[PDB]
PDB file of C-alpha atoms in Angstrom:
ATOM      1  CA  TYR E   1       2.243  -1.399  -5.088  1.00 12.72           C
ATOM      2  CA  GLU E   2      -0.612  -0.925  -7.008  1.00 11.03           C
ATOM      3  CA  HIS E   3      -1.083  -2.167 -10.104  1.00 11.95           C
ATOM      4  CA  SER E   4      -2.895  -2.969 -14.190  1.00 16.80           C
ATOM      5  CA  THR E   5      -3.174  -4.140 -17.048  1.00 14.86           C
ATOM      6  CA  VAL E   6      -4.856  -5.027 -19.398  1.00 17.11           C
ATOM      7  CA  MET E   7      -4.298  -9.202 -21.138  1.00 18.36           C
ATOM      8  CA  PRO E   8      -6.594 -11.154 -23.428  1.00 17.56           C
ATOM      9  CA  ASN E   9      -9.297 -14.061 -23.450  1.00 19.05           C
ATOM     10  CA  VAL E  10      -7.601 -17.347 -24.708  1.00 19.67           C
ATOM     11  CA  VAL E  11      -7.214 -19.915 -23.995  1.00 15.92           C
ATOM     12  CA  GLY E  12      -3.116 -20.859 -23.588  1.00 18.01           C
ATOM     13  CA  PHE E  13      -2.157 -17.729 -24.634  1.00 19.09           C
ATOM     14  CA  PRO E  14       0.659 -17.130 -22.535  1.00 14.49           C
ATOM     15  CA  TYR E  15       0.114 -13.449 -21.261  1.00 12.50           C
ATOM     16  CA  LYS E  16       3.794 -12.396 -19.226  1.00 13.90           C
ATOM     17  CA  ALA E  17       3.605  -8.789 -17.984  1.00 12.06           C
ATOM     18  CA  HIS E  18       6.390  -6.379 -16.788  1.00 11.60           C
ATOM     19  CA  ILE E  19       6.278  -4.234 -13.216  1.00 13.05           C
ATOM     20  CA  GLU E  20       9.518  -1.712 -13.454  1.00 15.37           C
ATOM     21  CA  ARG E  21       9.744  -0.092  -9.599  1.00 14.59           C
ATOM     22  CA  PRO E  22      12.078   2.376 -10.066  1.00 18.44           C
ATOM     23  CA  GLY E  23      13.713   1.623  -6.776  1.00 19.28           C
ATOM     24  CA  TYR E  24      13.704  -2.183  -7.736  1.00 19.72           C
ATOM     25  CA  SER E  25      14.686  -4.778 -10.621  1.00 19.40           C
ATOM     26  CA  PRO E  26      12.267  -5.107 -12.564  1.00 20.18           C
ATOM     27  CA  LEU E  27       9.751  -8.079 -12.533  1.00 20.94           C
ATOM     28  CA  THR E  28       7.945 -10.438 -14.866  1.00 19.36           C
ATOM     29  CA  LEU E  29       4.962 -12.503 -14.021  1.00 18.41           C
ATOM     30  CA  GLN E  30       3.401 -15.271 -16.299  1.00 17.23           C
ATOM     31  CA  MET E  31      -0.218 -15.185 -16.588  1.00 17.65           C
ATOM     32  CA  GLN E  32      -2.327 -17.915 -18.106  1.00 15.74           C
ATOM     33  CA  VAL E  33      -5.669 -18.294 -18.627  1.00 17.53           C
ATOM     34  CA  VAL E  34      -6.584 -22.855 -17.821  1.00 17.31           C
ATOM     35  CA  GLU E  35     -10.177 -22.774 -18.168  1.00 15.91           C
ATOM     36  CA  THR E  36     -13.412 -20.335 -18.783  1.00 13.29           C
ATOM     37  CA  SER E  37     -16.682 -21.215 -18.435  1.00 10.90           C
ATOM     38  CA  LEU E  38     -19.600 -18.235 -19.267  1.00  8.98           C
ATOM     39  CA  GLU E  39     -23.581 -19.592 -16.729  1.00  9.70           C
ATOM     40  CA  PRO E  40     -26.342 -18.078 -17.322  1.00  9.29           C
ATOM     41  CA  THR E  41     -29.343 -17.189 -15.204  1.00  6.56           C
ATOM     42  CA  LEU E  42     -31.985 -19.290 -15.637  1.00  4.13           C
ATOM     43  CA  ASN E  43     -35.618 -19.211 -15.132  1.00  5.77           C
ATOM     44  CA  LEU E  44     -37.804 -22.803 -15.352  1.00 13.58           C
ATOM     45  CA  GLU E  45     -41.135 -22.111 -17.194  1.00 15.60           C
ATOM     46  CA  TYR E  46     -42.073 -25.253 -17.436  1.00 12.98           C
ATOM     47  CA  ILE E  47     -41.830 -29.356 -18.580  1.00 11.06           C
ATOM     48  CA  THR E  48     -42.379 -31.537 -21.054  1.00  9.18           C
ATOM     49  CA  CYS E  49     -43.352 -35.360 -21.123  1.00  8.16           C
TER      50      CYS E  49
ATOM     51  CA  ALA N 293      49.495   1.812  -4.303  1.00  6.89           C
ATOM     52  CA  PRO N 294      48.980   0.615  -8.227  1.00  8.82           C
ATOM     53  CA  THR N 295      48.381   2.510 -11.088  1.00  7.66           C
ATOM     54  CA  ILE N 296      45.444   3.109 -13.046  1.00  7.68           C
ATOM     55  CA  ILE N 297      45.129   3.999 -16.846  1.00  5.33           C
ATOM     56  CA  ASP N 298      41.973   4.538 -19.151  1.00  6.46           C
ATOM     57  CA  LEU N 299      39.730   5.042 -16.535  1.00  8.76           C
ATOM     58  CA  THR N 300      36.022   5.489 -17.903  1.00  8.65           C
ATOM     59  CA  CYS N 301      32.456   6.061 -15.819  1.00 10.49           C
ATOM     60  CA  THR N 302      29.199   4.766 -17.271  1.00 10.82           C
ATOM     61  CA  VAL N 303      25.569   4.738 -15.052  1.00 13.30           C
ATOM     62  CA  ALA N 304      23.401   1.687 -15.471  1.00  9.77           C
ATOM     63  CA  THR N 305      20.998   3.100 -13.584  1.00  7.93           C
ATOM     64  CA  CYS N 306      20.015   6.185 -11.682  1.00  8.27           C
ATOM     65  CA  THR N 307      16.799   7.118  -9.398  1.00 10.41           C
ATOM     66  CA  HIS N 308      16.930   9.760  -7.807  1.00  6.93           C
ATOM     67  CA  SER N 309      15.565   8.367  -5.081  1.00  8.73           C
ATOM     68  CA  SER N 310      16.752   8.696  -0.553  1.00  9.05           C
ATOM     69  CA  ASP N 311      18.060   5.544  -0.140  1.00  9.59           C
ATOM     70  CA  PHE N 312      21.382   4.993  -2.533  1.00  9.14           C
ATOM     71  CA  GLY N 313      19.540   4.490  -6.019  1.00 10.47           C
ATOM     72  CA  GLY N 314      22.601   4.799  -8.997  1.00  8.39           C
ATOM     73  CA  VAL N 315      24.762   2.309 -10.287  1.00  7.61           C
ATOM     74  CA  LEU N 316      28.014   3.555 -11.572  1.00  9.39           C
ATOM     75  CA  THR N 317      30.323   1.063 -13.592  1.00 11.35           C
ATOM     76  CA  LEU N 318      33.812   2.408 -13.521  1.00 11.77           C
ATOM     77  CA  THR N 319      36.711  -0.024 -16.385  1.00 11.80           C
ATOM     78  CA  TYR N 320      40.102   0.996 -16.488  1.00 13.95           C
ATOM     79  CA  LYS N 321      43.871  -0.845 -16.711  1.00 12.67           C
ATOM     80  CA  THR N 322      45.775  -1.513 -13.284  1.00 12.40           C
ATOM     81  CA  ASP N 323      49.073  -3.104 -13.908  1.00  8.29           C
ATOM     82  CA  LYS N 324      48.195  -4.800 -10.170  1.00  9.94           C
ATOM     83  CA  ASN N 325      45.377  -5.605  -7.735  1.00  9.12           C
ATOM     84  CA  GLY N 326      44.435  -3.691  -4.820  1.00  4.68           C
ATOM     85  CA  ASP N 327      42.962  -1.485  -2.926  1.00  4.63           C
ATOM     86  CA  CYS N 328      41.869   2.175  -4.126  1.00  5.03           C
ATOM     87  CA  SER N 329      39.871   5.245  -2.342  1.00  3.80           C
ATOM     88  CA  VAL N 330      37.668   6.665  -4.342  1.00  6.29           C
ATOM     89  CA  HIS N 331      35.763   9.965  -4.490  1.00  5.25           C
ATOM     90  CA  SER N 332      33.435  12.053  -5.518  1.00  3.00           C
ATOM     91  CA  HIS N 333      34.130  16.044  -6.350  1.00  3.65           C
ATOM     92  CA  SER N 334      30.642  17.538  -6.156  1.00  7.05           C
ATOM     93  CA  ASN N 335      27.771  17.518  -3.394  1.00  8.79           C
ATOM     94  CA  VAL N 336      25.499  16.806  -6.048  1.00  6.34           C
ATOM     95  CA  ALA N 337      26.278  12.386  -6.322  1.00  3.75           C
ATOM     96  CA  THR N 338      27.465  11.036  -2.795  1.00  2.08           C
ATOM     97  CA  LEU N 339      29.008   7.574  -2.631  1.00  3.94           C
ATOM     98  CA  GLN N 340      28.825   4.583  -0.638  1.00  5.00           C
ATOM     99  CA  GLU N 341      32.222   3.724  -0.170  1.00  6.98           C
ATOM    100  CA  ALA N 342      35.859   5.038   0.489  1.00  4.50           C
ATOM    101  CA  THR N 343      37.918   2.379  -1.001  1.00  2.00           C
ATOM    102  CA  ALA N 344      37.827  -0.389  -3.870  1.00  2.00           C
ATOM    103  CA  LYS N 345      39.450  -3.436  -4.416  1.00  2.00           C
ATOM    104  CA  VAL N 346      40.790  -3.263  -8.034  1.00  2.00           C
ATOM    105  CA  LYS N 347      41.592  -6.069 -10.143  1.00  2.00           C
ATOM    106  CA  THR N 348      43.054  -7.162 -13.312  1.00  2.54           C
ATOM    107  CA  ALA N 349      40.034  -7.816 -15.085  1.00  7.59           C
ATOM    108  CA  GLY N 350      39.356  -4.211 -15.497  1.00  6.66           C
ATOM    109  CA  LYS N 351      35.474  -3.723 -14.068  1.00  5.34           C
ATOM    110  CA  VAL N 352      34.552  -2.132 -10.821  1.00  6.66           C
ATOM    111  CA  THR N 353      31.262  -0.534  -9.992  1.00  2.24           C
ATOM    112  CA  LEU N 354      29.525   1.589  -7.120  1.00  2.00           C
ATOM    113  CA  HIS N 355      26.571   3.564  -6.209  1.00  2.00           C
ATOM    114  CA  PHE N 356      25.635   6.511  -5.760  1.00  2.00           C
ATOM    115  CA  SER N 357      23.203   8.791  -4.138  1.00  2.00           C
ATOM    116  CA  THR N 358      21.618  12.167  -6.025  1.00  2.00           C
ATOM    117  CA  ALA N 359      18.516  13.824  -6.313  1.00  2.00           C
ATOM    118  CA  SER N 360      18.867  15.858  -9.393  1.00  2.00           C
ATOM    119  CA  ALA N 361      16.897  15.295 -12.259  1.00  2.00           C
ATOM    120  CA  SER N 362      20.816  15.337 -14.536  1.00  2.00           C
ATOM    121  CA  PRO N 363      23.399  15.349 -12.429  1.00  2.00           C
ATOM    122  CA  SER N 364      26.924  15.119 -13.201  1.00  2.00           C
ATOM    123  CA  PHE N 365      30.608  15.114 -11.879  1.00  2.00           C
ATOM    124  CA  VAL N 366      34.237  13.772 -11.259  1.00  2.00           C
ATOM    125  CA  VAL N 367      34.754  10.508  -9.404  1.00  2.00           C
ATOM    126  CA  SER N 368      38.323   9.410  -8.511  1.00  2.00           C
ATOM    127  CA  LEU N 369      39.978   5.976  -8.631  1.00  2.00           C
ATOM    128  CA  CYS N 370      43.184   6.296  -7.192  1.00  2.00           C
ATOM    129  CA  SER N 371      45.389   8.455  -8.914  1.00  2.00           C
ATOM    130  CA  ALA N 372      43.082   8.840 -11.641  1.00  2.00           C
ATOM    131  CA  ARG N 373      40.117  10.802 -12.678  1.00  2.00           C
ATOM    132  CA  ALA N 374      36.767  10.800 -14.765  1.00  2.00           C
ATOM    133  CA  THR N 375      33.544  12.366 -16.014  1.00  2.00           C
ATOM    134  CA  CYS N 376      30.072  11.022 -15.611  1.00  2.00           C
ATOM    135  CA  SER N 377      26.944  12.167 -16.151  1.00  2.00           C
ATOM    136  CA  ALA N 378      23.497   9.767 -16.355  1.00  2.00           C
ATOM    137  CA  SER N 379      19.169  10.558 -16.878  1.00  2.00           C
ATOM    138  CA  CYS N 380      17.151   9.569 -13.493  1.00  2.00           C
ATOM    139  CA  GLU N 381      13.833   9.158 -12.783  1.00  2.00           C
ATOM    140  CA  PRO N 382      11.489   9.618 -10.521  1.00  2.00           C
ATOM    141  CA  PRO N 383      10.548   7.533  -7.645  1.00  2.00           C
ATOM    142  CA  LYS N 384       6.598   6.122  -6.661  1.00  2.00           C
ATOM    143  CA  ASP N 385       8.008   5.855  -3.064  1.00  2.00           C
ATOM    144  CA  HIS N 386       5.459   8.640  -1.594  1.00  2.00           C
ATOM    145  CA  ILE N 387       6.915   7.822   1.663  1.00  2.00           C
ATOM    146  CA  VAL N 388       9.920   6.977   3.437  1.00  2.00           C
ATOM    147  CA  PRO N 389      11.097   6.438   7.564  1.00  2.00           C
ATOM    148  CA  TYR N 390      14.709   7.134   6.379  1.00  2.00           C
TER     149      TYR N 390
END
């Protein structure tokens, strides 16, 4: 059963999602973003000492 | 047989799916606990069971199936009678094997 949602990119924010399939009882998910990491791409140009 | 008076009908959830997709709650008042023969008086809704256990608490639940957006039917418990109406939402599943 496919589903889609949007959750904020804030660490520790206790996001909750609601999914309600008509033939069953609704379900709730707890999502949390424990850590993020934004790694760039590098090309070494030179080195100085 | 036990006697039933002041019988009222409410719907918790409806969904016109192939299976039994609606739950109905009956509130009543009885003198003694026992067995009743529940029925629906319209072919719009088909019940799951034909017999129910009444207890002095006064609440019972039933399951029914229908295929109309707005069902409306008369359900009878033992010798009583009441009117039920509901709103139903489409199911999301496309194909089933029953």
